[PDB]
Design a protein around this motif. Structure first.
Motif, PDB file in Angstrom:
ATOM      1  N   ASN A  49      37.783  35.023  21.553  1.00 31.51           N
ATOM      2  CA  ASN A  49      38.615  34.237  22.471  1.00 31.51           C
ATOM      3  C   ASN A  49      38.487  32.753  22.194  1.00 31.51           C
ATOM      4  N   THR A  50      37.576  32.426  21.275  1.00 29.93           N
ATOM      5  CA  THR A  50      37.270  31.055  20.867  1.00 29.93           C
ATOM      6  C   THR A  50      36.679  31.093  19.459  1.00 29.93           C
ATOM      7  N   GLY A  51      36.712  29.965  18.750  1.00 28.32           N
ATOM      8  CA  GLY A  51      36.132  29.901  17.425  1.00 28.32           C
ATOM      9  C   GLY A  51      37.249  29.972  16.410  1.00 28.32           C
ATOM     10  N   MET A  52      36.919  30.388  15.191  1.00 24.28           N
ATOM     11  CA  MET A  52      37.876  30.414  14.090  1.00 24.28           C
ATOM     12  C   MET A  52      38.159  31.832  13.605  1.00 24.28           C
ATOM     13  N   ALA A  53      39.177  32.452  14.161  1.00 31.79           N
ATOM     14  CA  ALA A  53      39.533  33.799  13.775  1.00 31.79           C
ATOM     15  C   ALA A  53      40.210  33.831  12.404  1.00 31.79           C
ATOM     16  N   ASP A  54      40.019  34.927  11.681  1.00 28.44           N
ATOM     17  CA  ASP A  54      40.765  35.133  10.445  1.00 28.44           C
ATOM     18  C   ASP A  54      42.250  35.392  10.691  1.00 28.44           C
ATOM     19  N   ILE A  55      42.542  36.271  11.639  1.00 30.12           N
ATOM     20  CA  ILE A  55      43.917  36.661  11.929  1.00 30.12           C
ATOM     21  C   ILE A  55      44.291  36.131  13.298  1.00 30.12           C
ATOM     22  N   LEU A  56      45.154  35.120  13.327  1.00 30.15           N
ATOM     23  CA  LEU A  56      45.695  34.648  14.592  1.00 30.15           C
ATOM     24  C   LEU A  56      46.961  35.432  14.928  1.00 30.15           C
ATOM     25  N   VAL A  57      47.001  35.958  16.142  1.00 29.82           N
ATOM     26  CA  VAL A  57      48.155  36.681  16.669  1.00 29.82           C
ATOM     27  C   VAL A  57      48.947  35.742  17.575  1.00 29.82           C
ATOM     28  N   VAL A  58      50.218  35.528  17.251  1.00 31.41           N
ATOM     29  CA  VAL A  58      51.031  34.526  17.927  1.00 31.41           C
ATOM     30  C   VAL A  58      52.364  35.118  18.356  1.00 31.41           C
ATOM     31  N   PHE A  59      52.835  34.762  19.555  1.00 31.54           N
ATOM     32  CA  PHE A  59      54.226  35.030  19.954  1.00 31.54           C
ATOM     33  C   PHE A  59      54.953  33.693  19.941  1.00 31.54           C
ATOM     34  N   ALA A  60      56.067  33.607  19.225  1.00 26.44           N
ATOM     35  CA  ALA A  60      56.785  32.336  19.127  1.00 26.44           C
ATOM     36  C   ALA A  60      58.253  32.591  18.895  1.00 26.44           C
ATOM     37  N   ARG A  61      59.034  31.518  18.973  1.00 28.74           N
ATOM     38  CA  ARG A  61      60.485  31.610  19.033  1.00 28.74           C
ATOM     39  C   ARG A  61      61.126  30.777  17.926  1.00 28.74           C
ATOM     40  N   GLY A  62      62.185  31.305  17.317  1.00 29.48           N
ATOM     41  CA  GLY A  62      62.992  30.536  16.383  1.00 29.48           C
ATOM     42  C   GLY A  62      62.196  29.836  15.297  1.00 29.48           C
ATOM     43  N   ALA A  63      62.473  28.548  15.091  1.00 31.02           N
ATOM     44  CA  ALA A  63      61.710  27.744  14.154  1.00 31.02           C
ATOM     45  C   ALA A  63      60.414  27.366  14.852  1.00 31.02           C
ATOM     46  N   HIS A  64      59.296  27.854  14.321  1.00 33.64           N
ATOM     47  CA  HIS A  64      58.021  27.779  15.038  1.00 33.64           C
ATOM     48  C   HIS A  64      56.900  27.233  14.162  1.00 33.64           C
ATOM     49  N   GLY A  65      57.243  26.384  13.208  1.00 32.75           N
ATOM     50  CA  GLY A  65      56.227  25.626  12.503  1.00 32.75           C
ATOM     51  C   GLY A  65      55.859  26.133  11.127  1.00 32.75           C
ATOM     52  N   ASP A  66      56.554  27.164  10.654  1.00 25.52           N
ATOM     53  CA  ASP A  66      56.339  27.666   9.294  1.00 25.52           C
ATOM     54  C   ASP A  66      57.694  27.885   8.596  1.00 25.52           C
ATOM     55  N   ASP A  67      57.685  28.468   7.402  1.00 31.29           N
ATOM     56  CA  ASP A  67      58.937  28.618   6.652  1.00 31.29           C
ATOM     57  C   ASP A  67      59.578  29.978   6.861  1.00 31.29           C
ATOM     58  N   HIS A  68      59.237  30.600   7.978  1.00 31.74           N
ATOM     59  CA  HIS A  68      59.728  31.922   8.272  1.00 31.74           C
ATOM     60  C   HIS A  68      60.295  31.916   9.676  1.00 31.74           C
ATOM     61  N   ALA A  69      61.295  31.069   9.902  1.00 28.67           N
ATOM     62  CA  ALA A  69      61.915  30.972  11.225  1.00 28.67           C
ATOM     63  C   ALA A  69      62.459  32.314  11.710  1.00 28.67           C
ATOM     64  N   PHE A  70      62.353  32.545  13.010  1.00 33.05           N
ATOM     65  CA  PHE A  70      62.898  33.741  13.617  1.00 33.05           C
ATOM     66  C   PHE A  70      64.389  33.560  13.922  1.00 33.05           C
ATOM     67  N   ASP A  71      65.014  34.624  14.399  1.00 32.84           N
ATOM     68  CA  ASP A  71      66.472  34.710  14.402  1.00 32.84           C
ATOM     69  C   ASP A  71      67.065  35.170  15.734  1.00 32.84           C
ATOM     70  N   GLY A  72      66.331  35.005  16.837  1.00 38.19           N
ATOM     71  CA  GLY A  72      66.787  35.469  18.131  1.00 38.19           C
ATOM     72  C   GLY A  72      66.608  36.966  18.277  1.00 38.19           C
ATOM     73  N   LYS A  73      67.161  37.551  19.334  1.00 38.69           N
ATOM     74  CA  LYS A  73      66.971  38.977  19.575  1.00 38.69           C
ATOM     75  C   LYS A  73      67.556  39.815  18.436  1.00 38.69           C
ATOM     76  N   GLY A  74      66.809  40.829  18.011  1.00 36.50           N
ATOM     77  CA  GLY A  74      67.236  41.684  16.914  1.00 36.50           C
ATOM     78  C   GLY A  74      66.829  41.138  15.559  1.00 36.50           C
ATOM     79  N   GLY A  75      67.311  41.760  14.496  1.00 29.95           N
ATOM     80  CA  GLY A  75      66.976  41.283  13.168  1.00 29.95           C
ATOM     81  C   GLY A  75      65.471  41.328  12.917  1.00 29.95           C
ATOM     82  N   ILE A  76      64.902  40.214  12.464  1.00 32.09           N
ATOM     83  CA  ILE A  76      63.457  40.106  12.239  1.00 32.09           C
ATOM     84  C   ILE A  76      62.685  40.272  13.530  1.00 32.09           C
ATOM     85  N   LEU A  77      61.683  41.138  13.550  1.00 29.70           N
ATOM     86  CA  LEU A  77      60.901  41.338  14.770  1.00 29.70           C
ATOM     87  C   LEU A  77      59.600  40.539  14.757  1.00 29.70           C
ATOM     88  N   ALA A  78      59.073  40.314  13.556  1.00 25.15           N
ATOM     89  CA  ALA A  78      57.750  39.724  13.373  1.00 25.15           C
ATOM     90  C   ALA A  78      57.563  39.447  11.894  1.00 25.15           C
TER      91      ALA A  78
END
Ligand SMILES: NC(=O)[C@H](CCC(=O)O)NC(=O)[C@H](CCC(=O)O)NC(=O)CCc1ccc(-c2ccccc2)cc1
Ligand SMILES: [Ca+2]
Ligand SMILES: [Ca+2]
Ligand SMILES: [Ca+2]
Ligand SMILES: [Zn+2]
Ligand SMILES: [Zn+2]
Length: 159
Positions: A49-78
């Motif tokens: 719940n704290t510290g430096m995890a190897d795998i961060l699990v994130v829920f985010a929307r649309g363009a969210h800070g990386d080069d793999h922007a999401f696309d709204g409902k449907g299409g890409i899920l994750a």
């Protein structure tokens, strides 16, 4: 052979929670998804719940800070990054989906099994029975199992 973790103890952290589901249900889905992969490899996963995890699990929307922007409902899920430092290994879920514990909307557990596959270094499979197949389709959560191809793939990377 693509990148793999060079250790067998891997931590994960849930950065944030979708409001679609009970917090307890998100924790459970994610823990059970890791267990699917731990069951057929030497890998062990611990939630922090704290510290430096190897795998961060994130829920985010649309363009969210990386080069793999999401696309709204449907299409890409994750999407998820393969093993590596920093963003490596992290698994991002599109909040524009409706995440569920069941067959409606998009099942979080099933999606997380697929994404963690990527976080561990698997690419997609052309085996229609594989969890690493490119497209999502709900299957009974209680009878869900990795396909022979998934197990072959992950055992070729670890152990
Ligand atoms: N079927 C689809 O096309 C769905 C839409 C939602 C739905 O139909 O309910 N979207 C997706 O499938 C997108 C498509 C991206 C593309 O290539 O452009 N794929 C993704 O977002 C990959 C995530 C993903 C893939 C397979 C499974 C799965 C579930 C149960 C058993 C076996 C495998 C879980 C998660
Ligand atoms: Ca990471
Ligand atoms: Ca989407
Ligand atoms: Ca949502
Ligand atoms: Zn992302
Ligand atoms: Zn995928």
């Amino acid at each position: 052979m693509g990148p793999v973790w060079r250790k067998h103890y891997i931590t994960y952290r849930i950065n944030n929670y979708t409001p679609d589901m009970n917090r307890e249900d998100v924790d459970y889905a994610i823990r059970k998804a890791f267990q699917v992969w731990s069951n057929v490899t030497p890998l062990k996963f611990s939630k922090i719940n704290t510290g430096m995890a190897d795998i961060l699990v994130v829920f985010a929307r649309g363009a969210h800070g990386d080069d793999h922007a999401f696309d709204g409902k449907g299409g890409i899920l994750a999407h998820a990054f393969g093993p590596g430092s920093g963003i490596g290994g992290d698994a991002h879920f599109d909040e524009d989906e409706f995440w569920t514990t069941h067959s409606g909307g998009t099942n979080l557990f099933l999606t997380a099994v697929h994404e963690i596959g990527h976080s561990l270094g698997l690419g997609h499979s052309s085996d229609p029975k594989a969890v690493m197949f490119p497209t999502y389709k709900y299957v009974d959560i209680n009878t869900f199992r990795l396909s022979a191809d998934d197990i072959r793939g992950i055992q070729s990377l670890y152990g």
